Coordinates of C-alpha atoms and ligand atoms in Angstrom, one line a residue:
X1 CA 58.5 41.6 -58.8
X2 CA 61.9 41.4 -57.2
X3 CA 62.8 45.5 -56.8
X4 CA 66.5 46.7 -55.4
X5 CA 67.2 49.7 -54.1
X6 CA 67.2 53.0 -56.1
X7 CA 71.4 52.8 -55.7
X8 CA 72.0 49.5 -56.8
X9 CA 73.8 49.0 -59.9
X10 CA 73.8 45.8 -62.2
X11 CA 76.8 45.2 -64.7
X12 CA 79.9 43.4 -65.6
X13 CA 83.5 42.1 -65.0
X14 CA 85.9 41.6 -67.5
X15 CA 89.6 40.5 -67.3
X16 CA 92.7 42.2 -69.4
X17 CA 94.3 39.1 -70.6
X18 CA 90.8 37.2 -71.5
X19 CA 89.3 40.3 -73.7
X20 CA 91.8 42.5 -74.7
X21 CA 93.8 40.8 -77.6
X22 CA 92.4 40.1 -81.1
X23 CA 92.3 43.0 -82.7
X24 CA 95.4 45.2 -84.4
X25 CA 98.3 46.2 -81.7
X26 CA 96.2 44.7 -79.1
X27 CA 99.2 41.9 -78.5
X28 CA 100.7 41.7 -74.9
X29 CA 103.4 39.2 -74.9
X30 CA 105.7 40.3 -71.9
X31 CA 103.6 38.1 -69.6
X32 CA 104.3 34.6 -67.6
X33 CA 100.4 33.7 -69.3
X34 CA 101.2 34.4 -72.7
X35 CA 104.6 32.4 -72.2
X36 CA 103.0 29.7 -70.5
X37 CA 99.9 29.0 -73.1
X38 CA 102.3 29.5 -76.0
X39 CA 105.0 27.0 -74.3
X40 CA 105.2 23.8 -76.6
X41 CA 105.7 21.0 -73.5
X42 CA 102.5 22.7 -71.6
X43 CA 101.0 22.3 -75.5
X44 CA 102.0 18.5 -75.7
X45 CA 101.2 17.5 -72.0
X46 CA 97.2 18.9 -72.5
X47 CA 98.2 21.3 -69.8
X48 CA 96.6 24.3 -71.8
X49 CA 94.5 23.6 -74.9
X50 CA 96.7 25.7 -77.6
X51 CA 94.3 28.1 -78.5
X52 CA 95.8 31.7 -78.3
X53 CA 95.2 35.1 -76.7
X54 CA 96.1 37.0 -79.0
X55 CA 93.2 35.2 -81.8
X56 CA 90.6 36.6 -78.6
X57 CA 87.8 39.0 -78.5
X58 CA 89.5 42.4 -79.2
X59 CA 88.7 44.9 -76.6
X60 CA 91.6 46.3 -76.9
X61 CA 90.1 47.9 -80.3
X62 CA 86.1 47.1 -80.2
X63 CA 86.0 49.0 -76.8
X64 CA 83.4 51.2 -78.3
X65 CA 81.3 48.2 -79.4
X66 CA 81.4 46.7 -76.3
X67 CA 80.5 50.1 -74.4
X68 CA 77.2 50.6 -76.9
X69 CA 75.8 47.1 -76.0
X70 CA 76.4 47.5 -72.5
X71 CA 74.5 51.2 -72.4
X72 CA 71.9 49.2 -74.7
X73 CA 71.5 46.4 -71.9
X74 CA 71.0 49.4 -69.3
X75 CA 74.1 48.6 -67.3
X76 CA 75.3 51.1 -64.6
X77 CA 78.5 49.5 -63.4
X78 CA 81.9 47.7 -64.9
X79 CA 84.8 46.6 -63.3
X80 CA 87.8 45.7 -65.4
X81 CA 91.8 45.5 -64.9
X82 CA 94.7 47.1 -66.1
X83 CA 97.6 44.8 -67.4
X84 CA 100.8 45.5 -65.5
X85 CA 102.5 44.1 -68.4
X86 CA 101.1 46.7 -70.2
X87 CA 102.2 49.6 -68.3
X88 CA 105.8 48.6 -67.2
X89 CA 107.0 45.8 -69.9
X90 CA 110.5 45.9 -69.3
X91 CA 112.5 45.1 -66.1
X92 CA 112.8 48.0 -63.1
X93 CA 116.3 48.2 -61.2
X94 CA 116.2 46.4 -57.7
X95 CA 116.1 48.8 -55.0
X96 CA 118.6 49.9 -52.4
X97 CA 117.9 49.4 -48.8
X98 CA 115.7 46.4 -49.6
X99 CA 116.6 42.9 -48.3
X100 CA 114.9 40.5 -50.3
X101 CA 115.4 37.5 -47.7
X102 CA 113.0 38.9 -45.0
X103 CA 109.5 37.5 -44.9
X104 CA 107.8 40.2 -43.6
X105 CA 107.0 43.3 -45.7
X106 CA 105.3 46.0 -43.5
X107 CA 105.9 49.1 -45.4
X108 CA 106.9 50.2 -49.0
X109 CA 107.3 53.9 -49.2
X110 CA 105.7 55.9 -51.7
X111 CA 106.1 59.7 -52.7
X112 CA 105.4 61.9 -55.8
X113 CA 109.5 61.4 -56.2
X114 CA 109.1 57.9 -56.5
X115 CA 105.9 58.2 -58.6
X116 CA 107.4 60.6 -60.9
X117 CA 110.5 58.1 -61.1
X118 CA 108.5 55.2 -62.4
X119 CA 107.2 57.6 -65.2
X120 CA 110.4 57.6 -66.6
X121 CA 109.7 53.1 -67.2
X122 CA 106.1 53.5 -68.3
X123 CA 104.7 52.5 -71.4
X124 CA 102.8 56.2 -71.9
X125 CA 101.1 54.6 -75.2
X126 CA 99.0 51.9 -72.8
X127 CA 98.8 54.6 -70.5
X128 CA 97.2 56.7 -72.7
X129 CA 95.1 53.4 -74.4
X130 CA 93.7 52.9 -71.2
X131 CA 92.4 56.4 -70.7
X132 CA 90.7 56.3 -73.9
X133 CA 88.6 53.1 -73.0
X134 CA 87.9 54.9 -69.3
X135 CA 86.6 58.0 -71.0
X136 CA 84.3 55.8 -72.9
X137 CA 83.4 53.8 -70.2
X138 CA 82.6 56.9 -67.8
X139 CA 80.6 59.1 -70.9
X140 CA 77.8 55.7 -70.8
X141 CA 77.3 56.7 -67.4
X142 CA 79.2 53.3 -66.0
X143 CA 80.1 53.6 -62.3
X144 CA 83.8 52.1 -62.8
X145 CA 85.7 49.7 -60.3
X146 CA 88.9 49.8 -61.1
X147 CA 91.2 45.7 -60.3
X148 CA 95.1 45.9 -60.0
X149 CA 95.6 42.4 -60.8
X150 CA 93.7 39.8 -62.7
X151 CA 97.0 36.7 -62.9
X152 CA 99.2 38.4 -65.3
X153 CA 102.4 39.1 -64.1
X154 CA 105.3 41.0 -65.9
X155 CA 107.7 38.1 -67.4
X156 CA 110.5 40.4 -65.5
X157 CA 108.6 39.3 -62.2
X158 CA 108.1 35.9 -63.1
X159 CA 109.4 33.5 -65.7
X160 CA 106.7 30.3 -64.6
X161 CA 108.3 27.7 -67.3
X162 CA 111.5 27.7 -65.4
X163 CA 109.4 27.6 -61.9
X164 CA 107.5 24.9 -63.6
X165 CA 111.2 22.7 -64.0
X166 CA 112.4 23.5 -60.7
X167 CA 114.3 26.3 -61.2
X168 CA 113.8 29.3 -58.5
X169 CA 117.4 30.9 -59.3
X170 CA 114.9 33.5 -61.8
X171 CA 112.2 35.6 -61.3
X172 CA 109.6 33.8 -59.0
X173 CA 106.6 35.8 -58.9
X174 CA 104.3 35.9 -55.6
X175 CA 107.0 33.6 -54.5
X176 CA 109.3 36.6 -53.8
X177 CA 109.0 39.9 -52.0
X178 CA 110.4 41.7 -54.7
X179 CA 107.2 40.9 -56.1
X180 CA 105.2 42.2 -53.5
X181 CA 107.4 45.3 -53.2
X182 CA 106.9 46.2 -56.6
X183 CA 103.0 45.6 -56.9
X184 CA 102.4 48.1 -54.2
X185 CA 104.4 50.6 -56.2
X186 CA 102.2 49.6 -59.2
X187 CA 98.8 50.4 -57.5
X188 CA 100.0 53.4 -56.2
X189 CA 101.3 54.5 -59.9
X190 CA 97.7 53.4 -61.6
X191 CA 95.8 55.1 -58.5
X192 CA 98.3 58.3 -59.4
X193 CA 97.1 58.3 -63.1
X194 CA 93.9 56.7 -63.5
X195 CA 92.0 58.1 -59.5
X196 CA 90.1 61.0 -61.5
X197 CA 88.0 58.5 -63.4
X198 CA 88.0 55.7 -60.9
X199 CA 85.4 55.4 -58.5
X200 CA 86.0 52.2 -56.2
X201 CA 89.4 50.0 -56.5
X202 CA 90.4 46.7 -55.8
X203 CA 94.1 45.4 -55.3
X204 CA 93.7 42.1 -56.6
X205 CA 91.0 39.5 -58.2
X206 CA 90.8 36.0 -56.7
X207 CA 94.4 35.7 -55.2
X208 CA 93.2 32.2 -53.6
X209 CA 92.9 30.5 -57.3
X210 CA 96.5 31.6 -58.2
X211 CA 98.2 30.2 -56.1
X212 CA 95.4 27.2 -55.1
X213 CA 95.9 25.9 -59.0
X214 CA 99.3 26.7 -59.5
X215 CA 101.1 25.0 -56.7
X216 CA 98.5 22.6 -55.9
X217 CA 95.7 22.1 -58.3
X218 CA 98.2 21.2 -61.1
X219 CA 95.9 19.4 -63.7
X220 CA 94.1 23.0 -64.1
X221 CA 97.0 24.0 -66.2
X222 CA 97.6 27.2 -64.4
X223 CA 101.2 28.6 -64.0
X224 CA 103.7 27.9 -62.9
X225 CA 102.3 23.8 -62.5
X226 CA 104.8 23.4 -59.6
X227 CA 103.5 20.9 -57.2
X228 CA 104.2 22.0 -53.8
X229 CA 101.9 22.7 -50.7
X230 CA 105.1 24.6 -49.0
X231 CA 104.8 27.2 -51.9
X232 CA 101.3 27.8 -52.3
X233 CA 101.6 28.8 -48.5
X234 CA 104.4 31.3 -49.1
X235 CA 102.3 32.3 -52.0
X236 CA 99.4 33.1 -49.8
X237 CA 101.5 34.9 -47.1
X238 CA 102.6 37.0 -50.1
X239 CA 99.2 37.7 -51.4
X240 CA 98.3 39.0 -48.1
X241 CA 101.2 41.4 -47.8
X242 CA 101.1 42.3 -50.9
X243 CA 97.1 43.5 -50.7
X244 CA 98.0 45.3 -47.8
X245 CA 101.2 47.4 -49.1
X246 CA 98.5 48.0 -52.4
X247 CA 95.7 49.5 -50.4
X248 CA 98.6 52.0 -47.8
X249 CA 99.8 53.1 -51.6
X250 CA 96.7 54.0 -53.0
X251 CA 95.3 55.4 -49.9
X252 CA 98.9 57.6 -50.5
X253 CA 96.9 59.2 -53.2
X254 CA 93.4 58.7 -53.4
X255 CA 91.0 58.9 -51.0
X256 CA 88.3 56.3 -52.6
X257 CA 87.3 52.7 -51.0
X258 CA 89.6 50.1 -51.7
X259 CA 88.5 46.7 -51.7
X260 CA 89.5 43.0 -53.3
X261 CA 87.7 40.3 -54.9
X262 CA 87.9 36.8 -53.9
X263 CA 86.5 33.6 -54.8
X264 CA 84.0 31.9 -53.0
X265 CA 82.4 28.3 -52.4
X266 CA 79.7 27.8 -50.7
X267 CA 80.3 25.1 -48.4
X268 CA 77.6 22.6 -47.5
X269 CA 76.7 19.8 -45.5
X270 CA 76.7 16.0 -47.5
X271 CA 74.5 15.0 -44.1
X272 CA 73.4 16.8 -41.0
X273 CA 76.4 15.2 -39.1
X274 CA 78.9 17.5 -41.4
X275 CA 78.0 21.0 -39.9
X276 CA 81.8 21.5 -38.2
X277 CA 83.1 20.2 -41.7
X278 CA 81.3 23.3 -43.1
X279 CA 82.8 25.3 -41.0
X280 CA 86.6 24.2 -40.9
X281 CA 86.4 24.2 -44.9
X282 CA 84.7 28.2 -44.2
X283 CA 87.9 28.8 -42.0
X284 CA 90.5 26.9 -44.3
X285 CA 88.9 29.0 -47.6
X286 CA 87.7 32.1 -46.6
X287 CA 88.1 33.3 -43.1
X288 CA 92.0 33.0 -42.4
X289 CA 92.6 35.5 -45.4
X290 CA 90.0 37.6 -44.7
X291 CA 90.8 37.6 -40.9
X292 CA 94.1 38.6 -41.8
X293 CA 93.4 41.6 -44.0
X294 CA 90.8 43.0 -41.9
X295 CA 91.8 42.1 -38.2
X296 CA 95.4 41.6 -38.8
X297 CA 95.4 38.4 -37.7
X298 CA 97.6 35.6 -38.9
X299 CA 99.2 32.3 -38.1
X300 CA 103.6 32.9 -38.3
X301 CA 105.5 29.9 -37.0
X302 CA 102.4 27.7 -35.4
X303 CA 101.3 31.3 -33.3
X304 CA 98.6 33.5 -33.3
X305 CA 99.3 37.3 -34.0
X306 CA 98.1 40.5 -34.9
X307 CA 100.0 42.1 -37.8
X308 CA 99.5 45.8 -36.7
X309 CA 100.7 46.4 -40.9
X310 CA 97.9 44.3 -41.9
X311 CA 95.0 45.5 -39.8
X312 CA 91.9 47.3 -41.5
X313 CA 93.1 47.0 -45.0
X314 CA 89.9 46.6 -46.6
X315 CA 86.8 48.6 -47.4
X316 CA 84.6 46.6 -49.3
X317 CA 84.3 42.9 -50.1
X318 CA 84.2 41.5 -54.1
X319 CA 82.2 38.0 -53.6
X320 CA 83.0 36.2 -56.6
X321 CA 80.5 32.9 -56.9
X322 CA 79.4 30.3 -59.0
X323 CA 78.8 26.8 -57.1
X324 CA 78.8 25.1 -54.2
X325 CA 81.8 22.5 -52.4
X326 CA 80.1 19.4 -50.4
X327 CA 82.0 18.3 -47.5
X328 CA 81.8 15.2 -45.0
X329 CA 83.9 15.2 -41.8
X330 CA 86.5 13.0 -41.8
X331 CA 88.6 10.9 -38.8
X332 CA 91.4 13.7 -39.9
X333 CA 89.4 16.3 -40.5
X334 CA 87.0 16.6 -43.8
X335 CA 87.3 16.5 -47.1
X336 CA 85.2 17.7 -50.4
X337 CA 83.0 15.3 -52.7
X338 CA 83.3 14.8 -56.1
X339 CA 79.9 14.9 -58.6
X340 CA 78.7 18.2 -56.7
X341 CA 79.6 21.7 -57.0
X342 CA 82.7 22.3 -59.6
X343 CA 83.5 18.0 -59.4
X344 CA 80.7 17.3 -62.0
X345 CA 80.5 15.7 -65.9
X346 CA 80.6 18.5 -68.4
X347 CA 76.7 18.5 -69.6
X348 CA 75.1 16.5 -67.3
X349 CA 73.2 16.7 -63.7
X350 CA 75.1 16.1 -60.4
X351 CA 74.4 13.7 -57.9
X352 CA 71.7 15.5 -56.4
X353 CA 70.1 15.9 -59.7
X354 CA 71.0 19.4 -60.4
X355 CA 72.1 20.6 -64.1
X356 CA 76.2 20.8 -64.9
X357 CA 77.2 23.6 -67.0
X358 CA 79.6 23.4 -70.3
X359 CA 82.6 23.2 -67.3
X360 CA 81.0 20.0 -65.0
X361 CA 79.9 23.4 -62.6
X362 CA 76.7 22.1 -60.7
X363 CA 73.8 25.0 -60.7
X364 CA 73.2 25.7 -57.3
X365 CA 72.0 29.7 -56.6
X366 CA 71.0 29.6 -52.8
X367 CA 75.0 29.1 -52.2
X368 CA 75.1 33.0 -53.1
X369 CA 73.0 34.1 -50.3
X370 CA 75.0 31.8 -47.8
X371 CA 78.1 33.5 -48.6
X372 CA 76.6 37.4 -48.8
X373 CA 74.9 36.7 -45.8
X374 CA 77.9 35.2 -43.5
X375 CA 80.4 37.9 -45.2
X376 CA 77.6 40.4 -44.3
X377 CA 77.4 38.8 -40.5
X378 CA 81.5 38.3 -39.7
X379 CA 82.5 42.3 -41.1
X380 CA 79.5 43.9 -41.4
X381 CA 81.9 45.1 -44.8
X382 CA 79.9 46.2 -47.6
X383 CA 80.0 43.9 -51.3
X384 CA 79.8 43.8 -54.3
X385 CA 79.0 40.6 -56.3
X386 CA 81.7 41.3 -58.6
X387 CA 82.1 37.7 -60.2
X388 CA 78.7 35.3 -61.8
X389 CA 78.1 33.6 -64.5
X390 CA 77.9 30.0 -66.3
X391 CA 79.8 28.1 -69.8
X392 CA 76.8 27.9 -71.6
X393 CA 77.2 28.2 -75.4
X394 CA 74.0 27.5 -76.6
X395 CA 71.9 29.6 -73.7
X396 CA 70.1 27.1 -72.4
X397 CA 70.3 27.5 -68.7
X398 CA 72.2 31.4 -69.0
X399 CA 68.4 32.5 -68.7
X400 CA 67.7 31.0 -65.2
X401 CA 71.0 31.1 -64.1
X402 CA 71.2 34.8 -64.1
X403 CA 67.4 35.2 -62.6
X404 CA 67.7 32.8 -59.8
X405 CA 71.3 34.4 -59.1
X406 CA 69.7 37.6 -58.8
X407 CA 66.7 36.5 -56.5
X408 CA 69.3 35.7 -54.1
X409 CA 71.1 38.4 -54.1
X410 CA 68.0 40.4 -53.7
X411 CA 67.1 37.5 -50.8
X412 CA 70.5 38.9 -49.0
X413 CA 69.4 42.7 -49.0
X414 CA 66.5 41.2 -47.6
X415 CA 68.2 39.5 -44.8
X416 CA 70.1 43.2 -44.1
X417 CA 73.1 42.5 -45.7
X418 CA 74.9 45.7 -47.9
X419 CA 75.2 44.2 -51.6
X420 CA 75.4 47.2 -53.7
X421 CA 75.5 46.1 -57.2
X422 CA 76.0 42.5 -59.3
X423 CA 78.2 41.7 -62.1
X424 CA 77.4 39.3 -64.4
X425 CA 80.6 37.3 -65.9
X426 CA 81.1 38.5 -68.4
X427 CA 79.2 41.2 -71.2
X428 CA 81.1 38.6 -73.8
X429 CA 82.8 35.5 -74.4
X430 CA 86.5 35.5 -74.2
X431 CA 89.6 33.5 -73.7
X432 CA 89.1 31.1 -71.0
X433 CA 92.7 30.7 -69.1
X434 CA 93.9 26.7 -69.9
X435 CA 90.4 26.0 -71.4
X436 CA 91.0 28.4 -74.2
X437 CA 88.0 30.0 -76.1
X438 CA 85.2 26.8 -76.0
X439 CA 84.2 27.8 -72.5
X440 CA 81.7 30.4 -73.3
X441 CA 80.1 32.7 -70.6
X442 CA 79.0 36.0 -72.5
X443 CA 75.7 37.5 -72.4
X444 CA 77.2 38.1 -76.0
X445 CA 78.5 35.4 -78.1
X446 CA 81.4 36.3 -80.0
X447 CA 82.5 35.2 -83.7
X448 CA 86.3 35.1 -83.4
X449 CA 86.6 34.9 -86.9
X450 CA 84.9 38.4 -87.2
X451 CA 85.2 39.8 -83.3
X452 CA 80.9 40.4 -84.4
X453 CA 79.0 39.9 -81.1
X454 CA 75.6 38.8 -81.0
X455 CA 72.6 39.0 -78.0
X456 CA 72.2 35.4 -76.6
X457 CA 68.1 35.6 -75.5
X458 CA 69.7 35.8 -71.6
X459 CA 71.1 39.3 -72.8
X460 CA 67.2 40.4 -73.8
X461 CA 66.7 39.2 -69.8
X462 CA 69.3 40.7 -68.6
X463 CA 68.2 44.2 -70.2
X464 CA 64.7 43.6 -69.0
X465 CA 66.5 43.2 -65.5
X466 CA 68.9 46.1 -65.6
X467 CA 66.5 48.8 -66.7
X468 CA 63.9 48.5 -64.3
X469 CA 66.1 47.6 -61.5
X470 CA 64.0 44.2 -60.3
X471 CA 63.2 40.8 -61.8
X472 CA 60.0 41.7 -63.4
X473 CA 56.9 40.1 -63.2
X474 CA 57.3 38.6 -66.4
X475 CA 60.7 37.2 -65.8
X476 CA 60.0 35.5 -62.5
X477 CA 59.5 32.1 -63.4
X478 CA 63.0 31.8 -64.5
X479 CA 64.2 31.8 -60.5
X480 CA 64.0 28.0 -61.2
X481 CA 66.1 25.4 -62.0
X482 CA 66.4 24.8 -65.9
X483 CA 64.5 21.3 -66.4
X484 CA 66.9 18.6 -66.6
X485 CA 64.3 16.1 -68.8
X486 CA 65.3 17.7 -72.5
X487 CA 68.8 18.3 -71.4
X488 CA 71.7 15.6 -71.7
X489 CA 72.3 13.0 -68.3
Ligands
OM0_501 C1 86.1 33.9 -62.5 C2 85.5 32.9 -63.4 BR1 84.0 31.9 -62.6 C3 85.9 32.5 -64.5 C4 85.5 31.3 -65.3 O1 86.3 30.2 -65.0 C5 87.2 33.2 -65.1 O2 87.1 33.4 -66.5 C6 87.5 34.5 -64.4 O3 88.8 35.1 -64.8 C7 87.5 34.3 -62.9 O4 87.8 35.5 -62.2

């Protein structure tokens, strides 16, 4: 048997926009997401697949379902986001004695003045919403992290089809300060409200993705589909700043860890002669940010600095996973291969002979200890794995995913590193960004037609996993890769 600590939690994450709609008043449409997967061009082009968010699973209403199944499984932890968009709709007046053309943001000032200010703009019936479904969570004994952001924005911050035609006269998102200004003002408010039933925070969830697939990764579908490597740096820059200013406001009024969660790759060698292409992918992916947030330290204008604003933001580490990247060194540098990692067929096996998930995602579990373990030696930061899962509608591989995911995490406590809990993705299927609902990763499969949710068999090992706190002997063979022979090549 595989035994964690007495401490260690197992759970879920779950994002606002994916789960919330589907049920009646649930329907958020003052975001640039809802725009941007209802716009008719993005429609046309393929960009997003023209399902809806609003035809999703219902949390927003079926919180109490949800809840039951999770106490049922014998989970212990959930983190989940509030929607922004939710909580201030409509537009806030631009401050005085804010210049919106300096780059650097090293302080946004926050006071129970301001706080009690912003009351006046909230939406007290999401407000209110919201503290239902945290009562609920907390009376099932859930340990709750509470995420900031999750890729919504309020339309009033950004408006991504104009963005997306090359228009930056409106609102811009992560592209402007105001942006940034008004998110650490946000965190502070929800921190304000929310701090007597939250127990650990995070500012933001995968920042990198945003902006990676937005300005750069355009075929994803992800808004605002504006090709430009210039902005998704200025995004990035912003991100950082705007993490920082988030954690200085809810430290303002709470005194709980405050972390963020990030996606991860694990990068790996094509041949033994691509060990310093491992590690300038680690440093172009992972370390800058994470250097900046922690040790302040950041590249402005082709120099190294220490940002003293920026310094020891952080408290814990979210380690989001699910494959690996294979890199060769290049004459210039490196680059990535395609069939491994997330470059494979849908339903198929990689080049190294490895099963591909319903999204081409190659199954490769010992990444997760690489990237616990060199978190764990770099910071010496405690993590959570806040992000893991697989498309699998019919359950096939869910089963070994999820053991063989946990062996390694259990493999990294091993090793010394401090991994205090793991969250599957997600307790149920829900909307799947630009994919729309056919990308299913629940432990529950969900009937839109009916918002019913059903056990999938990995939810029966997930329960035998969660309530005795180990993979049990009689689990253990599924640390092993599902057989590729009876599954499609
Ligand atoms: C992490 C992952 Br992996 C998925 C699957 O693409 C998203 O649904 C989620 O919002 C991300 O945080």
């Amino acid at each position: 048997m595989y035994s964690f600590p007495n401490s260690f939690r197992f759970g879920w994450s779950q994002a606002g926009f994916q789960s919330e709609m589907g049920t009646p008043g649930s329907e958020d449409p003052n975001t640039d997401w809802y725009k941007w997967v209802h716009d008719p061009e993005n429609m046309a082009a393929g960009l997003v697949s023209g399902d809806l968010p609003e035809n999703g699973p219902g949390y927003w209403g079926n919180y109490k379902t949800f809840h039951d199944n999770a106490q049922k499984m014998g989970l212990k932890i959930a983190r989940l986001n509030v929607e922004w968009s939710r909580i201030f709709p409509n537009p806030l007046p631009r401050p005085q004695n804010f210049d919106e053309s300096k780059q650097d943001v090293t302080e946004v000032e926050i006071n129970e003045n301001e706080l009690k200010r912003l009351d006046e703009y909230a939406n007290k019936d999401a407000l209110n919403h919201y503290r239902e479904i945290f009562k609920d969570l907390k009376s099932r004994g859930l340990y709750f992290i509470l995420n900031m952001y999750h890729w919504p924005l309020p339309l009033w911050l950004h408006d991504p089809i104009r963005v997306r035609r090359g228009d930056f006269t409106g609102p811009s998102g992560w592209l402007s300060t105001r942006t940034v200004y008004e998110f650490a003002r946000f965190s502070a408010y929800i921190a304000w409200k929310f701090d007597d039933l939250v127990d650990e925070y995070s500012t933001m969830n995968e920042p990198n993705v945003v902006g990676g697939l937005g300005y750069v990764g355009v075929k994803s579908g992800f808004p605002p589909g504006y090709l430009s490597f210039e902005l998704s740096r200025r995004h990035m820059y912003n991100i950082i700043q705007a993490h920082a200013r988030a954690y200085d406001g809810i430290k303002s009024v709470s005194k709980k860890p405050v972390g963020i969660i990030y996606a991860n790759s694990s990068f790996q060698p094509l041949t033994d002669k691509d060990m310093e292409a491992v590690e300038m992918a680690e440093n172009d992916n992972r370390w800058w940010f994470f250097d900046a947030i922690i040790r302040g330290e950041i590249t402005r204008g082709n120099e190294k600095i220490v940002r003293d604003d920026l310094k020891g933001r952080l408290d814990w580490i979210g380690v989001n996973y699910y494959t690996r990247t294979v890199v060769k060194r290049t004459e210039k540098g490196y680059v990535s291969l395609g069939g491994y990692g997330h470059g494979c067929e849908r339903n198929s096996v990689s080049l190294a002979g490895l099963p591909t998930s319903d999204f081409g995602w190659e199954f490769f579990p010992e990444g997760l200890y690489d990237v616990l373990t060199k978190y764990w030696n770099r910071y010496h930061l405690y993590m959570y794995v806040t992000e893991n899962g697989i498309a699998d509608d019919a359950d096939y591989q869910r089963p070994y995913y999820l053991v063989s995911h946990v062996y390694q995490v259990h493999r990294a406590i091993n090793s010394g590193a401090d991994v205090r809990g793991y969250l599957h993705w997600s307790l149920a299927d829900n909307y799947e960004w630009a994919s729309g609902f056919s990308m299913r990763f629940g432990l529950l499969k969900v009937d839109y037609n009916t918002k019913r949710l059903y056990w999938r068999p990995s939810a029966l090992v997930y329960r035998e996993i969660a309530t005795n706190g180990a993979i049990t002997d009689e689990i253990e063979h599924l640390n092993s890769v599902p057989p590729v022979k009876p599954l499609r090549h």
